[PDB]
Amino acid sequence: GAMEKPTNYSQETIASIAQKYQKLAEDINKDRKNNIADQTVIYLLSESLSDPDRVSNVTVSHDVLPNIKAIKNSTTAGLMQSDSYGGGTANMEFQTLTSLPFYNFSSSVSVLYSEVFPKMAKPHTISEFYQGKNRIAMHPASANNFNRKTVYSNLGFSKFLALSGSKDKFKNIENVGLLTSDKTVYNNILSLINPSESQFFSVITMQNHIPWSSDYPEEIVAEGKNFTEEENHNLTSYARLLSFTDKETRAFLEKLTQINKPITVVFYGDHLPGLYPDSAFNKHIENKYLTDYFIWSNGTNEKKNHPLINSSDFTAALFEHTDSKVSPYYALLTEVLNKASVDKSPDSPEVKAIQNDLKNIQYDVTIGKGYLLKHKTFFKI
Numbered sequence: 001g002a003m004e005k006p007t008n009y010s011q012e013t014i015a016s017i018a019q020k021y022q023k024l025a026e027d028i029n030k031d032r033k034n035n036i037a038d039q040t041v042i043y044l045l046s047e048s049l050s051d052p053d054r055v056s057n058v059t060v061s062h063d064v065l066p067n068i069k070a071i072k073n074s075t076t077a078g079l080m081q082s083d084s085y086g087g088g089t090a091n092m093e094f095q096t097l098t099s100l101p102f103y104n105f106s107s108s109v110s111v112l113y114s115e116v117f118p119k120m121a122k123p124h125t126i127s128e129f130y131q132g133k134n135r136i137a138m139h140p141a142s143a144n145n146f147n148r149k150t151v152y153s154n155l156g157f158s159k160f161l162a163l164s165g166s167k168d169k170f171k172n173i174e175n176v177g178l179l180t181s182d183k184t185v186y187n188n189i190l191s192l193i194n195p196s197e198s199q200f201f202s203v204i205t206m207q208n209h210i211p212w213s214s215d216y217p218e219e220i221v222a223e224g225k226n227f228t229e230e231e232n233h234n235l236t237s238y239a240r241l242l243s244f245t246d247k248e249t250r251a252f253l254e255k256l257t258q259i260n261k262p263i264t265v266v267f268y269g270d271h272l273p274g275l276y277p278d279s280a281f282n283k284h285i286e287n288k289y290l291t292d293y294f295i296w297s298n299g300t301n302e303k304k305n306h307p308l309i310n311s312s313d314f315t316a317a318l319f320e321h322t323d324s325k326v327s328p329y330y331a332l333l334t335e336v337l338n339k340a341s342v343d344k345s346p347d348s349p350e351v352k353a354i355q356n357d358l359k360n361i362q363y364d365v366t367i368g369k370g371y372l373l374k375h376k377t378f379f380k381i
């Protein structure tokens with residue numbers, strides 16, 4: 001099966017969970033000031049972006065993420081735990097939108113968009129708080145890769161910019177490396193931002209996707225202990241491409257500050273590039289699955305303490321960072337973010353209890369009975 005049924009799964013257990021977090025949402029909202037629908041949100045999946053400084057046996061001549069590191073110091077930011085290495089982009093993407101963690105599904109599941117999403121009766125995502133005409137997706141490749149076209153059509157999106165497979169195209173396409181530049185993606189985002197509307201962007205870049213090729217900037221060179229010439233060349237090409245994304249990301253956020261609209265960006269690398277051998281990590285193999293993330297608004301920014309979170313925790317962290325009122329569903333996800341996520345012990349009794357609540361909800365909305373359809377406020381603010 002796609003997911004194990006909790007031992008206590010039943011209509012009454014779902015009822016107990018709905019009521020419990022209905023009241024917790026009320027308490028949380030007594031201190032949440034804003035509404036998520038008042039701000040434009042941008043989920044920016046930065047393909048293969050991860051600071052090589054965390055790879056122990058790697059040496060780079062220059063810091064290739066100086067600007068992004070400065071952004072991380074100014075706002076809520078830290079490390080994201082990835083579920084795969086060198087691939088799995090769409091699986092992280094699914095988790096950001098639904099907030100349903102991959103680690104609760106079965107290992108037999110390969111692509112969540114193909115095996116789980118189609119079986120969900122009414123999938124709830126962050127984009128449902130926005131009007132269909134204001135939901136926008138972007139990816140410089142085939143819209144049908146990993147079944148994205150079907151996902152974003154079923155989610156009521158009005159646009160899906162893609163190099164092929166959809167009516168919506170990118171403008172002024174330029175290549176940095178072999179593939180479409182992040183600059184092109186960023187500028188196409190800006191051209192679509194409508195200050196008169198609250199919008200939701202789901203973006204998946206391609207510039208830093210394998211294969212990596214770049215001869216500039218020449219001064220940036222990188223090597224790893226006992227690497228082959230090919231491995232050193234791929235690392236060098238990747239490090240050079242990161243330096244461009246770093247500068248372009250800074251300029252992108254700068255432009256967002258000049259727009260008269262509250263805008264928040266959830267920026268993250270989906271996984272490390274598949275160019276490092278396991279030896280490169282030495283004493284810290286955990287760094288094989290730790291990418292960079294930040295949650296940045298175009299106005300004033302708090303800095304919540306979340307040094308290590310999952311891709312499924314982003315929405316709950318978004319609501320917290322923007323002090324937005326939550327629904328009973330996101331009240332549960334706020335307890336997971338703070339008390340029962342990947343940074344906590346899986347043997348803690350509190351982590352188990354909160355995870356049991358999540359597993360019952362997660363099972364109910366995927367391949368379960370759908371008891372939550374009768375709890376009509378569980379997903380509403």
Ligand SMILES: O=P(O)(O)OC[C@@H](O)CO
Pocket residue numbers: 086087088089090139141142145146204209
């Ligand atoms: O890194 P991967 O898993 O190949 O993702 C690529 C995908 O974004 C192409 O549409």
Ligand SMILES: [Ca+2]
Pocket residue numbers: 031032033323
């Ligand atoms: Ca508050």
Ligand SMILES: [Mn+2]
Pocket residue numbers: 047048086087088089270271
């Ligand atoms: Mn990827």
